[PDB]
Coordinates of C-alpha atoms and ligand atoms in Angstrom, one line a residue:
X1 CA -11.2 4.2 -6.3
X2 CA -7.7 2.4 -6.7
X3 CA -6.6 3.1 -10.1
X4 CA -3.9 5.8 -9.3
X5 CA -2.2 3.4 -6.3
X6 CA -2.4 0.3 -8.4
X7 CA -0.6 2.6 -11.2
X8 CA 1.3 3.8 -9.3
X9 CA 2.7 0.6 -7.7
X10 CA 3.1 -1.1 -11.3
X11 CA 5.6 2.2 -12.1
X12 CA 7.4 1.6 -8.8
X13 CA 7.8 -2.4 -8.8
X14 CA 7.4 -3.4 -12.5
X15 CA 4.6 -5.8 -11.5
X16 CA 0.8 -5.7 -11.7
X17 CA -0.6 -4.3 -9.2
X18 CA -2.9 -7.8 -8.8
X19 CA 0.3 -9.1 -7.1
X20 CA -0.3 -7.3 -4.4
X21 CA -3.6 -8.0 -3.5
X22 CA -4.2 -10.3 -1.4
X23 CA -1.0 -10.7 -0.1
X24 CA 0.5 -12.0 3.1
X25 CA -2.0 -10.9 5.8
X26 CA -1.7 -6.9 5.4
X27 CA -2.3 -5.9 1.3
X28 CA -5.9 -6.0 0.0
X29 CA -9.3 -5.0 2.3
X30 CA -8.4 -4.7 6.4
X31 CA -6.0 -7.4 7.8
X32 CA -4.7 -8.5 11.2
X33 CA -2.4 -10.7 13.0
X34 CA 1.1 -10.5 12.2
X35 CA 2.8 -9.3 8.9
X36 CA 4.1 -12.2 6.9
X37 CA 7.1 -10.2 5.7
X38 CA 8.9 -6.9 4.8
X39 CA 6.1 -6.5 1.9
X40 CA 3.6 -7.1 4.2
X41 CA 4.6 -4.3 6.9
X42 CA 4.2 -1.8 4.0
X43 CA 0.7 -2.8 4.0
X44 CA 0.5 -2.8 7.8
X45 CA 1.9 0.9 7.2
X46 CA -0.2 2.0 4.5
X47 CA -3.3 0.5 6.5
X48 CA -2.1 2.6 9.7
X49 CA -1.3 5.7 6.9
X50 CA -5.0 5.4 6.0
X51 CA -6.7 5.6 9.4
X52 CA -4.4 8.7 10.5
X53 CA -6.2 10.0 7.4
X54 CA -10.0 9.1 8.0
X55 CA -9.3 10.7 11.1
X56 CA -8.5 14.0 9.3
X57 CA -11.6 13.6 8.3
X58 CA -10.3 12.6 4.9
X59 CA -12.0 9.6 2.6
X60 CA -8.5 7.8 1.3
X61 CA -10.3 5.2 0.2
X62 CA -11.9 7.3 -1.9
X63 CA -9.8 10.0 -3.0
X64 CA -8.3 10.7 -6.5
X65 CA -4.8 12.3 -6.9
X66 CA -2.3 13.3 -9.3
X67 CA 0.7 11.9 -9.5
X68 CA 3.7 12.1 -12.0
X69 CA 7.4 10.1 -11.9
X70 CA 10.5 11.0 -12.9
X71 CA 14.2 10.5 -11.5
X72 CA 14.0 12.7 -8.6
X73 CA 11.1 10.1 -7.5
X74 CA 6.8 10.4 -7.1
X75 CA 5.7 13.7 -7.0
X76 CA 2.5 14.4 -5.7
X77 CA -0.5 16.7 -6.5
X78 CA -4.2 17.5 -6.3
X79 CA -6.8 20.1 -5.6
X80 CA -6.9 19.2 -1.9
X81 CA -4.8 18.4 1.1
X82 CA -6.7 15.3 1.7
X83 CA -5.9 14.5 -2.0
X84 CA -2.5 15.0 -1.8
X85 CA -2.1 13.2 1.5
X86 CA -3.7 10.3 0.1
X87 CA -0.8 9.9 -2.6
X88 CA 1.7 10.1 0.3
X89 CA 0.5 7.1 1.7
X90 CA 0.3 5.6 -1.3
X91 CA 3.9 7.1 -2.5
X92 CA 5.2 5.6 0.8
X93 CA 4.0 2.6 0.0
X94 CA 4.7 1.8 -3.4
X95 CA 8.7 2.9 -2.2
X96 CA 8.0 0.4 0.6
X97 CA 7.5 -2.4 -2.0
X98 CA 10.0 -1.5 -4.6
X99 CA 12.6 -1.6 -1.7
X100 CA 11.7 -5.4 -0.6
X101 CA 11.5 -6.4 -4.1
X102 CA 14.4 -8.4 -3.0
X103 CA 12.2 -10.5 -0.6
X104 CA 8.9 -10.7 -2.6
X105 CA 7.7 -14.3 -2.0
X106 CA 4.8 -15.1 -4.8
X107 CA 3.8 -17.8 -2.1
X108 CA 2.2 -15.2 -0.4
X109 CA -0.1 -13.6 -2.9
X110 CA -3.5 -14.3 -2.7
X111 CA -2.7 -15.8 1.2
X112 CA -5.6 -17.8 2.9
X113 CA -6.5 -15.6 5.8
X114 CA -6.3 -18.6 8.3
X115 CA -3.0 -18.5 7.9
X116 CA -2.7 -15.0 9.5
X117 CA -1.8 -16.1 13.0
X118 CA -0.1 -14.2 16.3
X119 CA -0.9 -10.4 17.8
X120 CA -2.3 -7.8 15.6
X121 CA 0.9 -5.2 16.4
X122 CA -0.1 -1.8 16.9
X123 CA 0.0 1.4 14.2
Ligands
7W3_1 C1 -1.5 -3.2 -2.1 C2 -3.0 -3.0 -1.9 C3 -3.4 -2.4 -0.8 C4 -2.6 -1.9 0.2 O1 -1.7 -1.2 0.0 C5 -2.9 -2.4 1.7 N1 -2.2 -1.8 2.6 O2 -3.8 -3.2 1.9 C6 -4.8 -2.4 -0.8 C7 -5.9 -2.0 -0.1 O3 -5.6 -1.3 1.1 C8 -6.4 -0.2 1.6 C9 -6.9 -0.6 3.0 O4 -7.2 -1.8 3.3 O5 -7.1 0.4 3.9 C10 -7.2 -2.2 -0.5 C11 -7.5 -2.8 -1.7 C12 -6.4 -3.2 -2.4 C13 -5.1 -3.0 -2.0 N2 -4.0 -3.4 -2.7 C14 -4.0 -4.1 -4.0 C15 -4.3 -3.2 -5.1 C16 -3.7 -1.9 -5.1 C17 -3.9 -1.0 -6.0 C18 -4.7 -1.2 -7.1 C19 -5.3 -2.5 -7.2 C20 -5.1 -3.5 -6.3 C21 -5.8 -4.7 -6.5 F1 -6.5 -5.1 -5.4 F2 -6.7 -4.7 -7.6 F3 -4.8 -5.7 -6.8
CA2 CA1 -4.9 -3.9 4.1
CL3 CL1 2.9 5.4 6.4
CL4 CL1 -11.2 17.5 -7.4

């Protein structure tokens, strides 16, 4: 249920949201081991934003939110709390990227997970 992030993230970054999926060790389903790079500690962060949700007893893997942006940045909306703290995470997130645009590395989408190597650091 990842249309809104994946909008969201093409607003923020200006790319598809395909790019980034998959990437480093952190974007896409789970990860572990050590972040690749600044990108990759969003998705680190997000993953670690998502598990202080689920126990909330919210389902942000799930959730569908409302979201709007305009100058003054991502505002955020829904009917529930949950909701809306699902589109925090995913606000936070999609700032993280558009801020390390700068170090985006395409080499890294789509990243073999044998690769991911090192300690899984801590949320
Ligand atoms: C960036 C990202 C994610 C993350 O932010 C992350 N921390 O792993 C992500 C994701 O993370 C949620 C999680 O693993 O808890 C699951 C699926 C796709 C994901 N993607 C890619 C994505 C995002 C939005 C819409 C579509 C896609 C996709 F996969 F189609 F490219
Ligand atoms: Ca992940
Ligand atoms: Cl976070
Ligand atoms: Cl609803």
């Amino acid at each position: 249920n990842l249309v809104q992030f994946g909008v969201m993230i093409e607003k923020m970054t200006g790319k598809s949201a395909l790019q980034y999926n998959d990437y480093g060790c952190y974007c896409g389903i789970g990860g572990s081991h050590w972040p690749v790079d600044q990108t990759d500690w969003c998705c680190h962060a997000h993953d670690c934003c998502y598990g202080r949700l689920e126990k909330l007893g919210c389902e942000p893997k799930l959730e569908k939110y409302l979201f709007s942006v305009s100058e003054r940045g991502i505002f955020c909306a829904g009917r529930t709390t949950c909701q809306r703290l699902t589109c925090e995470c995913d606000k936070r997130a999609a700032l993280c990227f558009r801020r390390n645009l700068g170090t985006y590395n395409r080499k890294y989408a789509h990243y073999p997970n044998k690769l991911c190597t090192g300690p899984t650091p801590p949320c």
